[PDB]
Design an enzyme around this catalytic site. Structure first.
Site, mmCIF file in Angstrom:
data_model
loop_
_atom_site.group_PDB
_atom_site.id
_atom_site.type_symbol
_atom_site.label_atom_id
_atom_site.label_comp_id
_atom_site.label_asym_id
_atom_site.label_seq_id
_atom_site.Cartn_x
_atom_site.Cartn_y
_atom_site.Cartn_z
ATOM 1 N N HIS A 1 -10.203 29.165 17.230
ATOM 2 C CA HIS A 1 -10.706 27.867 16.730
ATOM 3 C C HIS A 1 -12.229 27.682 16.867
ATOM 4 C CE1 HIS A 1 -6.676 26.503 15.944
ATOM 5 N NE2 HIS A 1 -6.332 26.486 17.217
HETATM 6 O O1 TFG Z 1 -2.591 21.500 18.622
HETATM 7 C C1 TFG Z 1 -3.439 21.556 19.519
HETATM 8 C C2 TFG Z 1 -3.890 22.952 19.856
HETATM 9 C C3 TFG Z 1 -5.141 23.364 20.104
HETATM 10 C C4 TFG Z 1 -5.266 24.712 20.220
HETATM 11 C C5 TFG Z 1 -4.114 25.384 19.997
HETATM 12 C C6 TFG Z 1 -3.870 26.894 19.988
HETATM 13 O O2 TFG Z 1 -4.115 27.401 18.615
HETATM 14 O O3 TFG Z 1 -2.481 27.136 20.223
HETATM 15 C C7 TFG Z 1 -4.741 27.751 20.924
HETATM 16 F F1 TFG Z 1 -6.054 27.526 20.741
HETATM 17 F F2 TFG Z 1 -4.420 27.569 22.198
HETATM 18 F F3 TFG Z 1 -4.466 28.991 20.581
HETATM 19 S S1 TFG Z 1 -2.890 24.262 19.676
HETATM 20 N N1 TFG Z 1 -3.973 20.389 19.898
HETATM 21 C C8 TFG Z 1 -3.381 19.199 19.245
HETATM 22 C C9 TFG Z 1 -2.605 18.348 20.186
HETATM 23 N N2 TFG Z 1 -3.256 18.277 21.494
HETATM 24 C C10 TFG Z 1 -2.967 17.445 22.555
HETATM 25 C C11 TFG Z 1 -1.959 16.467 22.481
HETATM 26 C C12 TFG Z 1 -2.193 15.206 23.036
HETATM 27 C C13 TFG Z 1 -1.242 14.190 22.974
HETATM 28 C C14 TFG Z 1 -0.023 14.428 22.338
HETATM 29 C C15 TFG Z 1 0.216 15.676 21.758
HETATM 30 C C16 TFG Z 1 -0.744 16.688 21.828
HETATM 31 C C17 TFG Z 1 -3.824 17.747 23.530
HETATM 32 N N3 TFG Z 1 -4.640 18.738 23.137
HETATM 33 C C18 TFG Z 1 -4.334 19.096 21.888
HETATM 34 C C19 TFG Z 1 -4.968 20.183 20.963
HETATM 35 ZN ZN ZN Z 2 -1.808 27.725 18.427
#
Ligand code: TFG
Ligand code: ZN
Ligand code: K
Ligand code: K
Length: 361
Positions: free
Chosen positions: A115
């Site tokens: 990202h």
């Molecule tokens: O979907 C993500 C991800 C960011 C990075 C993701 C990844 O692609 O899986 C990585 F970078 F770890 F590989 S997945 N979010 C959206 C939801 N979120 C939250 C949430 C906060 C409240 C409710 C649900 C989710 C905290 N931080 C994030 C970042």
């Molecule tokens: Zn992811």
């Protein structure tokens, strides 16, 4: 030994009660897979290496030590330092495979990288480890053609950005898209590249939500119809994989939502191993359910080592992909038939099961 390599470094660990990379490393030890691999020594990426993708200011801010309680701001300082180390670990493994010192590899690294944009960290990513490895392969070894496959459930916006005008790197992302309504909101099928890079960015974007969730049959079908035909035509010299495992069953509705099996990732790895003479490196991206990511890591490493894979269940091999997946695949093929000869000759068989496709081929 000319075999499968690994990279891991305890200096990436949060505490300095196992996290993700420590749990993956432990599984590889316990299963004996670690014993069959060559674990190499990692290192920090140089500021110059980081700057093949990122701005000087970005690299200086997050890549420099200012001079640990995980609940304080110093946790994030450490995570940014861990990111600098992760990039060097991936670069080292990638170069050892690309020069033929090793056959292939898996990088057990954190934080993820896919990202992080030129001058913006986001989604837990500071530096785009896979993109930096790819830039250095070009600049230091003049590698003519590089395939990057990103099968994390979220779109790799940084990697798309880094090579969007470059036809010498084919970027292929499989991801939940749902018409712009899933993090990070990018990676529409229509995004095909710019300039000379037009046609060399492939967003296998799944739309339709979780009615039903995407699973093994849908991803296998996407590999059959979009990924492998396009990748084979391109004929890369080296394959890099942003290997997130958040599509595996056990990751809930926003931070996942799909029900892939860990076993399926072994088969997806084995498919990519037919390209580039087997010159392939996977780097851990996302995924967080410890059982799911350990199972998946085990399946991938086992495949890289050439071990016979656990057969997929007959049910999966006989399953026709769901209607939303078929629609998603057919939209992508339609768009990319402009740029790829493998999508110009034909009619769609995206709705067939694997066995049906095999029977009818
Ligand atoms: O979907 C993500 C991800 C960011 C990075 C993701 C990844 O692609 O899986 C990585 F970078 F770890 F590989 S997945 N979010 C959206 C939801 N979120 C939250 C949430 C906060 C409240 C409710 C649900 C989710 C905290 N931080 C994030 C970042
Ligand atoms: Zn992811
Ligand atoms: K992806
Ligand atoms: K590209």
């Amino acid at each position: 030994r000319f075999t499968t390599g690994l990279v891991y470094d305890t200096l990436m660990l949060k505490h300095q009660h196992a996290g993700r990379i420590q749990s993956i490393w432990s599984r590889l030890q316990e299963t004996g897979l670690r014993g069959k691999c060559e674990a190499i020594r990692g290192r920090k990426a140089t500021l110059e290496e980081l700057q093949t993708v990122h701005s000087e200011a970005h690299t200086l801010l997050y890549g420099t030590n200012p001079l640990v309680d995980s609940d304080t701001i110093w946790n994030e300082v450490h995570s940014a330092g861990a990111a600098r180390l992760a990039v060097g670990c991936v670069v080292e493994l990638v170069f050892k495979v690309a020069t033929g010192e090793l056959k292939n590899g898996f990088a057990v690294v954190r934080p993820p990288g896919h990202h992080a944009e030129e001058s913006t960290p986001m989604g837990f990513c500071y530096f785009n480890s896979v993109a930096v490895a790819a830039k250095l392969l070009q600049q230091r070894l003049s590698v003519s053609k590089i395939l990057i496959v990103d099968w994390d459930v979220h779109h790799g916006n940084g990697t798309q950005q880094a090579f969007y005008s470059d036809p010498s790197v084919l970027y292929m992302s499989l991801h939940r898209y749902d018409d712009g309504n899933f993090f990070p909101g990018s990676g529409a099928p229509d995004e095909v590249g710019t300039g000379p890079g037009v046609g060399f960015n492939v967003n296998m974007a799944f739309t339709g939500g979780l009615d039903p969730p995407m699973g093994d049959a849908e991803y296998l079908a996407a590999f059959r119809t979009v990924v492998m035909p396009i990748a084979s035509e391109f004929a890369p010299d080296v394959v890099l994989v942003s290997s997130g495992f958040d599509a595996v069953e056990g990751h809930p509705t926003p931070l996942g939502g799909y029900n892939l099996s860990a076993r399926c990732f072994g088969y997806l790895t084995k498919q990519l191993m037919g390209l580039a003479g087997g010159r392939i490196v996977l780097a851990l991206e996302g995924g967080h359910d410890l059982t799911a990511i350990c199972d998946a890591s085990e399946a991938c490493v086992s495949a890289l080592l050439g071990n016979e894979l656990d057969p997929l269940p007959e049910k999966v091999l006989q399953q026709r992909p769901n209607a939303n997946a078929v629609r998603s695949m057919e939209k992508v093929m339609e768009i990319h038939s402009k740029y790829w000869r493998c999508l110009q000759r034909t009619t769609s068989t995206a709705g067939r099961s694997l066995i049906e496709a095999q029977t009818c081929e």
